[PDB]
Design a protein around this nucleic acid. Structure first.
Lengths: 143, 206, 100, 63, 141, 145, 82
RNA sequence: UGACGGAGCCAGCGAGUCUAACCUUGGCCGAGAGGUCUUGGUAAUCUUGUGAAACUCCGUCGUGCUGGGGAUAGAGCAUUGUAAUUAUUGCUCUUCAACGAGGAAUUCCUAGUAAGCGCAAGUCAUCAGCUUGCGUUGAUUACGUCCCUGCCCUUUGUACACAC
RNA sequence: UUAAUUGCGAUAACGAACGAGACCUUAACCUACUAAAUAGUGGUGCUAGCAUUUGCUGGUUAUCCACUUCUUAGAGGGACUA
């Protein structure tokens, strides 16, 4: 029939890939998660305690795949939001870089993402090769 | 005619609707007529659109804002009360859910209920301010059909915003329950009570 | 040599004529070159109050300066390039040449 | 009381303290040639259909 | 040598450029299929052309769209105008003008913005007020 | 989707260190009723105690809270990096601590009194009740005395 | 000194949030004859907690008695199959 | 129609380098902040294909002075500043404080305006609730009137003349 | 009749000047002496999926080849109540 990445939905991909990462249990997270703010503007940590990092890794993996070169500061901007400075009007605030940095070196550690020229990250060959099993559930069910 | 398949995957439900005739997915945008000829050509029919988000040019002409689709006009007055100015992206979402909620009750055509609601709460006569000799009275005057639709949409949307405020009810379900009673006629819906109250006061202040 | 002469004047009419006669003078030497590249105009906006003191309605006048930058790519020997650029020099226009 | 339906045939002009109403000449839908002049609160125009909560009234002005 | 046509649609500040050729009946936006934006409100907006004249004009034509500028709803508007012009320009060059003038007549009747880029550009803001016409506040005592 | 049998063991009120802690509400937002532990601190103490976040204050066993209170009493024992606590490097001792339901007011009185006894600018301001963080007193704060 | 208040009364709502057998089997036998079932419908008719309404709704669709039509957030539209 | 947690990500004005460390790009482990190095364009290929706030599948509490609460205190962590104690500014932690469609009164507004939202520039030693520009999402009448306070013209009365 | 002491026009006035207008700035179709690979490129080179049948994205650096309709704004342009 023909196989391609983007020809599937985006909303079900991010969750399904994260469950793939969680089930495999190979992301190699040191464990200091569920402590830090995850964003200086976000005053509460993620609710999904057992997750929130398999999805974030899933989120960046799709993000780096669709882009060509990305950086730690760039992904902080992408995942950042608005900080409620109470009475002061809202302003855009970047996220903490450690969560984004250590989610990419984890992708490096397991083979999803390889370093790229001119600085930044890139979708790797191993990272793309495991998307076939990811899209298999989507294609089998609807057809 | 011979049907052929396509390598490119495009969903069948959209294709099936497009194949034979123009129509909504399951909603019957056709035969949504109103028995009252007074508001005819002042509620939108015979121009079925696929969604309540069309950026129709309504400021170029005196009345082109009145040839606007009646669902879009309903969507616009729901887009009010401060923090909801703009955000039409959700104002159509509520009407999508309200039409869903309207369908699950009152098994007849869901769209007809809205147009019957609008045609049922348009005040037929209200009273206007007259100065007199300082202060004498108020004078009752007839209401144009365009003014009717303006008030009929407003009262339905005012009632919903004031009903879902500070209560469990969502703006979608309560905007339905105002349209259910307005279309059927209950004298308890926010739009209907105000409609006859304005009519009643106009009768006294003829 | 892959020279790139640049032009950073403000008067468009002065820029357009001096660039037109830079191409025709370079073409009359039967040399290779590229046509002009029109970069976006760079308006410089100075928004200031009109009043000298702090009395009156808050009225503001916004002065603008238009900057027009144009570059043309040429490959011509320097012993003719020097005698090409310095001639037909125009007041107000800024015609300058770079090396590499 | 059974209300009546009516169609405008002529518009006279704006009246009222702030011009918020308009005089219109109106023809009855049944038993035509029965003219009537009514005041309309909203924007009205030619060949528009008017509802009257009562019929046998004629307000020539409004001040 | 491949029959192609490049066209544009515009919005308030969005712009979509369509590359329309004689292909395999595929429609794509920004490297992704047009059918999977799925916000369930504007799916029909980009579907409006093929929904009202069918796929008889979409059998062997591949369309790829690159939209940029504006916001989500604006980009979608540009996307519709890009694909609308591409089908118009495609039947202008290759297919009979009869096919083009009839699809323009249906597209115009359904929605003028399917052919005309909306001439409602924003109004610049002026001093003494928060917006173009709104003022700050008039205080008297 | 998960459903449970509700017994009489449900506690409409909880007794944590002489303070009434509400039941029938989330444990994380129930602990905010304690002076000194709020949305984040309750989030951490519940993570350390490994209590299911989805559960209420109703079906919580006594042991589940006894570790929660132990974390609240001695946070530095569980290897806390000393930036969550509300009292780091106390002036009286220099050691990392964390205030309690009744200790937060006691130390707030103690830290306010030392400014008062040394007659600092801050201390005379707290003794005066005026703003101490540089806020202008010309406009704000008229109906407060 | 005046504080410019109204201070209206309250109804003293009693939305129970931990459900026992009496409520569990009441909703189970009463989810029929309900043309429109939602989160707010459950709490305004069976007086259950707000989170119970959405959790129970997930339970009624997991086994399956009430057939959802619109799965949108902030507004859940479930009907009963007949 | 709302807060929070994810996640999807989309504009436009514009600025940035000599007796230069300003424009935080990536390889500073560092982790809000900024010291390491600067590989960096006569500033579309560097910040920024502005890659941002708003908005928008899915889930967390459900109408309470509640997850609408740093408004007000205390404790600590950082950089610009021969120097901040009357928070310079940013960051992490505790409690609810008034506030529950705000009285008389009052302001602005006729289109992609209003309104929601946020960003660049001026100020600037980092970081401004203001201004100037803007751009994102985008509402009810527009056949209006002079009674609603003031303009324009004419006629008329005046015992007014810087003149009701 | 005026978002106009704007004009048509009785006319002891005629002929004028200033103001209004006109003028200057933006959006956007000229596809031919307005574009560098400073922007989709039409064919370089291959890598990560399925069909051996016809896709979905990354790119060394002066061979280029019938190259310009989108933020770029000159010359008969265009909208004057056609």
């Amino acid at each position: 029939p023909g196989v391609s990445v983007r020809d599937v939905a985006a909303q079900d991909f991010i969750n399904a890939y994260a469950s793939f990462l969680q089930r495999q249990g190979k992301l190699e997270v040191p464990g200091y998660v569920d402590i830090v703010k995850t964003s200086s503007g976000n005053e509460m940590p993620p609710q999904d305690a057992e997750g929130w990092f398999y999805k974030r890794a899933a989120s960046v993996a799709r993000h780096i795949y669709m882009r060509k070169q990305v950086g730690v500061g760039k992904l902080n901007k992408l995942y950042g939001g608005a900080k409620s400075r109470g009475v002061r009007p809202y302003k855009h605030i970047d996220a903490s870089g450690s969560i984004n940095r250590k989610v990419l070196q984890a992708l490096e550690k397991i083979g999803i993402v390889e370093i790229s020229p001119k600085g930044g990250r890139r979708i790797s060959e191993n990272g793309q090769r495991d998307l076939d099993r990811i899209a298999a559930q989507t294609l089998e069910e609807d057809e | 005619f011979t049907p052929v398949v396509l390598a490119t995957p495009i969903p069948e439900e959209v294709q099936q609707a497009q194949t034979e005739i123009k129509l909504f997915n399951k909603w019957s945008f056709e035969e949504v007529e109103v028995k009252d000829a007074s508001l005819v050509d002042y509620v939108q029919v015979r121009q079925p659109i696929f969604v309540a988000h069309t950026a129709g040019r309504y400021a170029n002409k005196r009345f082109r804002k009145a040839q606007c689709p009646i669902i879009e006009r309903l969507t616009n007055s729901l887009m009010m009360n401060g923090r909801n100015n703009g955000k039409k992206l959700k104002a159509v979402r509520i009407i999508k859910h309200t039409l869903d909620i309207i369908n699950v009750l009152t098994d007849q055509n869901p769209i007809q209920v809205v147009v019957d609601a609008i045609t049922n709460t348009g005040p037929r006569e209200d009273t206007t301010r007259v100065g007199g000799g300082g202060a004498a009275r108020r004078q009752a005057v007839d209401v144009s059909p365009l003014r009717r639709v303006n008030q009929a949409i407003a009262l339905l949307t005012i009632g919903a915003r004031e009903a879902a405020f500070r209560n469990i009810k969502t703006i979608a379900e309560t905007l339905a329950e105002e349209l259910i009673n307005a279309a059927k006629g209950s004298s308890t819906s926010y739009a209907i009570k105000k409609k006859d109250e304005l009519e009643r006061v106009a009768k006294s202040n003829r | 040599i892959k020279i790139r002469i640049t032009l950073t004047s403000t008067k468009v009419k002065q820029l357009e004529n001096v660039s037109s006669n830079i191409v025709k003078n370079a073409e009359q030497h039967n040399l290779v070159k590229k046509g002009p590249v029109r970069l976006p105009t760079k308006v410089l906006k100075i928004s200031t109050r009109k009043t000298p003191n702090g009395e009156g309605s808050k009225t503001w006048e916004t002065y603008e300066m238009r900057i027009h930058k144009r570059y043309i790519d040429l490959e011509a020997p320097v012993q003719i390039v020097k005698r090409i650029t310095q001639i037909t020099i125009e007041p107000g226009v800024d015609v300058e040449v770079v090396v590499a | 009381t059974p209300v009546t339906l009516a169609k405008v045939i002529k518009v006279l002009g704006r009246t009222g303290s702030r011009g918020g109403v308009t005089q219109v000449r109106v023809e009855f839908l049944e038993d035509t040639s029965r003219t009537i002049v009514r005041n309309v609160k909203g924007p009205v125009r030619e060949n528009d259909i008017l509802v009257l909560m009562e019929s046998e009234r004629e307000a020539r002005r409004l001040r | 040598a491949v029959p192609s046509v490049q066209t544009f649609g515009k919005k308030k500040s969005a712009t979509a450029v369509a590359h329309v050729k004689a292909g395999k009946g595929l429609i794509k936006v920004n490297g992704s299929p047009i059918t999977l934006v799925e916000p369930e409100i504007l799916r029909f907006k980009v579907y409006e052309p093929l929904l009202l004249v069918g796929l008889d004009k979409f059998s062997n034509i591949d369309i790829r769209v690159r939209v940029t500028g504006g916001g989500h709803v604006s980009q979608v508007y540009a996307i519709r105008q890009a694909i609308a012009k591409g089908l118009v320009a495609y039947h202008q060059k290759y297919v009979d003008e009869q096919s083009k003038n009839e699809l323009k007549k249906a597209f115009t009747s359904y929605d003028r913005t399917l052919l005309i880029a909306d001439s409602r550009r924003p109004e610049p803001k002026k001093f003494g007020g928060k917006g173009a016409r709104s003022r700050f506040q008039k205080s008297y005592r | 989707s998960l459903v449970v049998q509700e017994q009489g063991s449900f506690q409409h009120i909880l007794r944590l260190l002489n303070t009434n802690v509400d039941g029938n509400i989330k444990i994380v937002y129930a602990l905010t009723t304690i002076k000194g532990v709020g949305r984040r601190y309750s989030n951490l103490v519940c993570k350390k105690a490994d209590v299911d976040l989805h559960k209420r204050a109703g079906e919580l066993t006594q042991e589940e809270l006894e570790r929660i209170v132990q974390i609240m009493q001695n946070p530095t024992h569980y290897k806390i990096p000393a930036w969550f606590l509300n009292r780091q490097n106390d002036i009286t001792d220099g050691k990392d601590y964390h205030t309690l339901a009744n200790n937060v007011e006691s130390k707030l009185r103690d830290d306010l009194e030392r400014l008062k006894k040394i007659r600092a600018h801050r201390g005379i301001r707290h003794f005066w009740g005026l703003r101490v963080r540089g806020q202008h007193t010309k406009t704000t704060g008229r109906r407060r005395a | 000194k005046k504080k410019w208040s109204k201070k209206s009364m309250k109804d003293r709502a009693q939305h129970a949030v931990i459900l026992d057998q009496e409520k569990y089997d009441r909703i189970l036998k009463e989810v029929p004859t309900y043309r429109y079932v939602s989160v707010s419908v459950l709490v305004d008719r069976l007086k259950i907690g707000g989170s119970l309404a959405r959790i129970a709704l997930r339970h009624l669709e997991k086994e399956g008695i009430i057939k959802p039509i619109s799965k949108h957030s902030k507004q859940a539209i479930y009907t009963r199959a007949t």
